[PDB]
Amino acid sequence: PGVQVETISPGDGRTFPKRGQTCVVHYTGMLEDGKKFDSSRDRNKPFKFMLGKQEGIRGWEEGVAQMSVGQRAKLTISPDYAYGATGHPGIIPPHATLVFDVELLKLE
Ligand SMILES: CCO/N=C1/C[C@@H]([C@H](C)C[C@@H]2CC[C@@H](O)[C@H](OC)C2)OC(=O)[C@@H]2CCCCN2C(=O)C(=O)[C@]2(O)O[C@@H](CC[C@H]2C)C[C@H](OC)/C(C)=C/C=C/C=C/[C@@H](C)C[C@@H](C)C(=O)[C@H](OC)[C@H](O)/C(C)=C/[C@H]1C
């Protein structure tokens, strides 16, 4: 409900990120039925982060944790699992549902 994870291409079905593990991903984020606000693909540089230890929005952490290595997935994140009633001023409006197209490339 807070985050829906829908497969674009399956992963290995077996290797999922552990809390504290470094995840290497490509992503594109857009406002649902609106504008693209960020893409690591457009920078040709994958995004690395430590799941849990480097805190992200709830739907990102819980959505990526549900993915296995190699998986590409559409994450639809409700505002309560994203930036909420305040949004992220200047970038994400109040009460925004977010879509991320995420590909889990590697776990380090
Ligand atoms: C994963 C963890 O990494 N996330 C990050 C940002 C995250 C969100 C802003 C964080 C707050 C934390 C507090 C909670 O209260 C807030 O709740 C409302 C959420 O962003 C996201 O969660 C999502 C999902 C991942 C891709 C980016 N993202 C977006 O929405 C965007 O696409 C956006 O364009 O990203 C961009 C921002 C705007 C979004 C719409 C991302 C931004 O660019 C230039 C980048 C890459 C910034 C990097 C900062 C690094 C700083 C370090 C010193 C330390 C760092 C590792 C930490 O440890 C921090 O702690 C102490 C914290 O951990 C941070 C800042 C992690 C970064 C890597």
Numbering used by the authors: 0 to 107
From the paper:
Rapamycin alone has low affinity for mTOR. It is the rapamycin-FKBP12 complex that presents a complementary binding surface for the mTOR FRB domain to assemble into a ternary complex. Here, we present selecTOR, a chemical-genetic platform that restricts the activity of a rapamycin analog to specific cell populations through targeted expression of a mutant FKBP12 protein. This analog has decreased affinity for FKBP12, rendering it ineffective at binding and inhibiting mTOR, but preferentially binds a mutant FKBP12 with an expanded pocket, allowing it to selectively inhibit mTOR in cells where this mutant protein is expressed.
Rapa*-3Z once again emerged with the most favorable combination of potency and mutant selectivity, inducing the FKBP12 V55G ternary complex with an EC50 of 11.8 nM and the wild-type complex with an EC50 of 639 nM. The asymmetric unit contained two protein molecules which aligned closely with one another (root mean square deviation [RMSD] = 0.3 Å) and are each bound to one Rapa*-3Z molecule. Our structure aligned closely with a published structure of rapamycin bound to FKBP12 (21) (RMSD = 0.4 Å), an indication that the modifications did not significantly alter the overall protein fold or binding pose. In the wild-type structure, the C-32 ketone of rapamycin points toward the F46 and V55 side chains. In our structure, the added ethyloxime moiety extends into a pocket created by the V55G mutation. We see that this substituent clashes with the wild-type residue, preventing the binding of Rapa*-3Z and leading to its selectivity for the mutant protein. The mutant structure also revealed conformational changes to nearby residues Q53, E54, and W59. Q53 and E54, which make up part of the loop that packs under rapamycin C-28, have rotated and swapped positions in the mutant structure, leading to a closer interaction between the alcohol on Rapa*-3Z and the π-system of E54. We also see that the indole side chain of W59 rotates in the mutant structure to meet the ethyl group of Rapa*-3Z, helping to fill the void left by the V55G mutation. Taken together, these observations show that it is both the creation of a larger binding pocket and subtle restructuring of the surrounding region that allow FKBP12 V55G to tightly bind Rapa*-3Z.
